[PDB]
Symmetry: C3
Subunit: 75 residues, 3 copies
C-alpha cells in the first residue's frame, strides 16, 4: 500500500499548498495595508493572518512527516 | 546505513513537530490575548512568539533536507 | 531522469534554506531592536520581515513538494 498511500499524501500536500498560497496572499495584502496606513487595528489584523499562515505551515509539515513515514516502509 | 539514518531522522522530525505544536499553541494563546486587549506589549509578545515559531519551522525544514539527502543515497 | 532531478531539487532546497536562514537572521535582529525600543515603526518592520520569512518558507515547501513528486516516479 505504501506507493498508493504516497500518491494520496502528495495530493494532500498539493491541496494544502494551494490553501497556504491563498493565506500568504491574504497576509501580503494585509501587510501592504499596514504599511500604507499603520495603526493598532492593522497591526493586529496582520499578526492574525501571520499566525494563521504559520498554522497552515504546521499542517503542511505534518503531511511531509506522513510522506517520510510512508516512504520508510518500502525503504 | 541510509535506511537506518532515515529512521532516526523521522524520529527527529516527530520530536521537532511536537515542539512546533507547543510553540503554535503558545502563539495562538498570545494572539487571543492580543485580540482581547490590544496594546504595544501584547503586540511585541505576539511577534516574539511568531518569530520563535518561524525559527522552529526553519529547524524542521533542515531535518527534511537531511531526509532528502539520506534518501538520495539509496536512489 | 528521476534520480538526477532529485539531485537538482536537493541543491535547490539547500540554496533556498541558505536564503531562509539569512531571512531568519534579519527577522531575529529586527525582533531584538523591537524589544529594545518598541514603536509603531519597529512593529511594522518586524512584521514585514516576518511575512517575508513566511514567503520564503512557502517557496521551500514547494521545492519539497517537487521532491515528493519526483520520488513517486521511481516508487
Ligand atoms: N522521500 C522524501 C521526499 C520528500 C522530501 C523528504 C521527506 C519526504 C518528502 C519523503 C524525502
Ligand atoms: Na507580527
Amino acid at each position: 500500500d505504501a506507493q498508493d498511500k504516497l500518491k494520496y499524501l502528495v495530493k494532500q500536500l498539493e491541496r494544502a499548498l494551494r490553501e497556504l498560497k491563498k493565506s500568504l496572499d491574504e497576509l501580503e495584502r494585509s501587510l501592504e495595508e499596514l504599511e500604507k496606513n499603520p495603526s493598532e487595528d492593522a497591526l493586529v489584523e496582520n499578526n492574525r493572518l501571520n499566525v494563521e499562515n504559520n498554522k497552515i505551515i504546521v499542517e503542511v509539515l505534518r503531511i511531509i512527516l506522513e510522506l517520510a513515514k510512508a516512504s520508510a516502509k518500502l525503504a
